[PDB]
Amino acid sequence: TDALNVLLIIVDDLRPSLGCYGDKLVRSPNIDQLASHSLLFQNAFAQQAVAAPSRVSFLTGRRPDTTRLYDFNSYWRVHAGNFSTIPQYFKENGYVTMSVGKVFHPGISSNHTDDSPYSWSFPPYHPSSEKYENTKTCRGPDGELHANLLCPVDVLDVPEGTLPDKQSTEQAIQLLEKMKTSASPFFLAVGYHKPHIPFRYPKEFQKLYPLENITLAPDPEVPDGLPPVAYNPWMDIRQREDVQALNISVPYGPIPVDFQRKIRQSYFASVSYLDTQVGRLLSALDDLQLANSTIIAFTSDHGWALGEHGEWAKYSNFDVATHVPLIFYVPGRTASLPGEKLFPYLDPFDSMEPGRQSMDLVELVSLFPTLAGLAGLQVPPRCPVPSFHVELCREGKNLLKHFRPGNPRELIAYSQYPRPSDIPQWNSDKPSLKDIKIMGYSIRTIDYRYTVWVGFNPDEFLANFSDIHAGELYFVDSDPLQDHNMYNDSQGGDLFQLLMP
């Protein structure tokens, strides 16, 4: 009798544009193969659609209003409370905990040390080639180097001749080989960068998605019923040279159709590129015969809009920005134990069945208790309200029962996002704490998304639910794309019904 290892794979800005989530265009065979042996959650949502608030949230198992981290300019242990993290908890329980790539968000939000010395057994590994993503590293048709958003590259014509996710993969495999020697179990966090911008990927993956067979988003127009407060102006992508040359109007655009299809091409290519890296990682796991002793959790920190509602990037409460993939492989539980190989590398350039599936509405803040339980450790207790004074507790439910009384909150996935004003402006994507004046709280059920943009006081961290600036109500059955806001024609009977037993 032993304890199970954990391989946690986190992808930056990955929406569920994957074969195992019903996307019949994107080629993600290795992830689909992971899913075929796993439990796939169809309705998983991040608590805030931006890197640091989301990552600090689900790494401490607390919600953004407990971490009080809505930007990326505060360290929770000083700002809110000495909240313990997932890897810290495993390390305290005899695990060797290791971080590769972007797990914590770098900078102050992790105290510049990836939350050292609490979380990791040794200083995390960050791939060196990441620092060239936003340099003049994209060779154009006329032979010059540019800092382009769409950046298909020959690996032999970039600095250091590699890419950050290839480095992360290589280093993760080596650590797995080392741990096969150790007597202790491992908790390995691998944080992949793509499809986060820029779209710098091996140019061969671009051939998988010819532009002729690329369509726009189903709802590329900005909906009439979308209140301006809920619109994000996607300012970060406007700084890239190729984007800047199009002279796209601020803040509503639109992006020229041809470039919209090119963005989707490069995003899909980056996903397939990501998929091969995951393939290499999982295939190495198989060769080392760790498949029968290692939990694999695969998810993302938030989504990314590709023209839906005239939006791009995250910084939103729409499903496209909050809906994330979430897959759990549990040896001998989600699939039969394996010289059998479960994750052989699959080549997307070669032209499966859905594994277990769950439609329950779940939240990234439930990641902490789930992994702790699945690994055989003690599940931290539920948090009180507030829990600033508590170091180890969880505000989300454990999903372990789901692998074989109706509280209304078990029917909800919560999301939120701040705004500095009602009209989209320069900092509406990523407002700093002092500049936050509105907080958009969103409720997502199997039936609808209900959002209210309410007055917010950043000095007291106080929401005023009597100062509603605007509201949104989208119905899954009739309006899955969320194009027809029904909040003005509503009275609140949907919330009442949810409360009534």
Ligand X SMILES: *[C@@H]1O[C@H](CO[C@@H]2O[C@@H](C)[C@@H](O)[C@@H](O)[C@@H]2O)[C@@H](O[C@@H]2O[C@H](CO)[C@@H](O)[C@H](O)[C@H]2NC(C)=O)[C@H](O)[C@H]1NC(C)=O
Ligand Y SMILES: *[C@@H]1O[C@H](CO)[C@@H](O[C@@H]2O[C@H](CO)[C@@H](O)[C@H](O)[C@H]2NC(C)=O)[C@H](O)[C@H]1NC(C)=O
> Which two tokens mark 313?
């990037």
Please, which residues bridge with residue 108 across strands?
none
Q: Which of the listed partners (ligand Y, ligand X, Ca ion, none) does 311 bind, with a CB threshold of 5 to 8 Å by partner kind?
A: none
CB of 466 to ligand Y, least distance (A): 14
Site stretch for ligand X (CB under 6 A), options 43-51, 142-150, 263-271, 464-472: 464-472
Nearer to ligand NAG, 212 or 477 (CB): 212
Does residue number 2 form part of the binding site for ligand Y (CB under 6 A)? yes
User: Cα(426)–Cα(431) distance, rounded to whole angstroms?
Assistant: 9
Q: Which of 392, 372, 376 is nearest to 384 (CA)?
A: 392
Per-residue CA distances from 48 to 55, 68, 210 (Å): 9, 12, 33
Residue 456 phi, psi (nearest 5): -135, 135
Does residue number 350 form part of the binding site for ligand NAG (CB under 6 A)? no
CB of 292 to ligand Y, least distance (A): 4
Q: Could you tell me where the beta strands, DSSP code E, fall in 321-476?
A: 323-324, 326-329, 356-358, 362-363, 413-419, 438-444, 448-457, 462-475
CB of 443 to ligand X, least distance (A): 21
Does residue number 119 form part of the binding site for ligand X (CB under 6 A)? no
Using CB under 6 A, pick the residue from 23, 42, 73, 77 that binds ligand Y: 77
Q: Which of the listed partners (ligand Y, ligand NAG, Ca ion, none) does 460 bind, with a CB threshold of 5 to 8 Å by partner kind?
A: none
Using CB under 6 A, pick the residue from 82, 113, 121, 490 that binds ligand X: 82
Q: Which of the listed partners (ligand Y, ligand NAG, Ca ion, none) does 293 bind, with a CB threshold of 5 to 8 Å by partner kind?
A: ligand Y
Using CB under 6 A, pick the residue from 218, 467, 484, 492 that binds ligand X: 467
CB of 479 to ligand NAG, least distance (A): 30
Nearer to ligand X, 333 or 437 (CB): 437
* Per-residue b or e along 457-468, where b marks 16 or more CB atoms closer than 10 Å to that residue's CB: ebeeeebeeeee
* DSSP states along 48-68: SSSHHHHHHHHHHT--HHHHT
Going residue by residue from 411 to 450, which x/- string records binding to ligand NAG, judged by CB under 6 A?
A: ----------------------------------------
Going residue by residue from 191 to 230, which x/- string records binding to ligand NAG, judged by CB under 6 A?
A: -------------------x-xx-----------------
Q: Which of the listed partners (Ca ion, ligand X, ligand NAG, none) does 12 bind, with a CB threshold of 5 to 8 Å by partner kind?
A: Ca ion
Chain residues that interact with Ca ion, rule: CB under 5 A: 12-13, 51, 301
Per-residue CA distances from 329 to 339, 361, 376 (Å): 19, 19, 15
> Which two tokens mark 268?
């899909």
- For 183, counting Cβ atoms within 10 Å of its Cβ (0-12 exposed, 13-18 middle, 19+ buried), the class is exposed
Contact 449, 474 (CB under 8 A): yes
Nearer to ligand NAG, 6 or 208 (CB): 208
User: Cα(319)–Cα(389) distance, rounded to whole angstroms?
Assistant: 33
Using CB under 6 A, pick the residue from 121, 293, 427, 432 that binds ligand Y: 293
Give residues 222-281 in contact with ligand NAG (rule: CB under 6 A).
Answer: 247
Does residue number 73 form part of the binding site for ligand Y (CB under 6 A)? no
Give the helix ranges, DSSP H, for 223-360: 241-244, 257-287, 319-322
CB of 307 to ligand NAG, least distance (A): 20
Site stretch for ligand X (CB under 6 A), options 42-50, 67-75, 348-356, 463-471: 463-471
Does residue number 485 form part of the binding site for ligand Y (CB under 6 A)? yes
Give residues 210-269 in contact with ligand Y (rule: CB under 6 A).
Answer: 225
User: Cα(34)–Cα(478) distance, rounded to whole angstroms?
Assistant: 32
Please tell me whether the peptide bond between 210 and the residue prior to it is cis, using omega within 30 degrees of 0.
Answer: no
User: Cα(347)–Cα(272) distance, rounded to whole angstroms?
Assistant: 10
Does residue number 357 form part of the binding site for ligand NAG (CB under 6 A)? no
Contact 228, 424 (CB under 8 A): yes
Q: Which of the listed partners (ligand Y, ligand NAG, Ca ion, none) does 247 bind, with a CB threshold of 5 to 8 Å by partner kind?
A: ligand NAG
The residue ranges that bind ligand X (CB under 6 A) are 82, 84, 118, 391-392, 464, 466-467
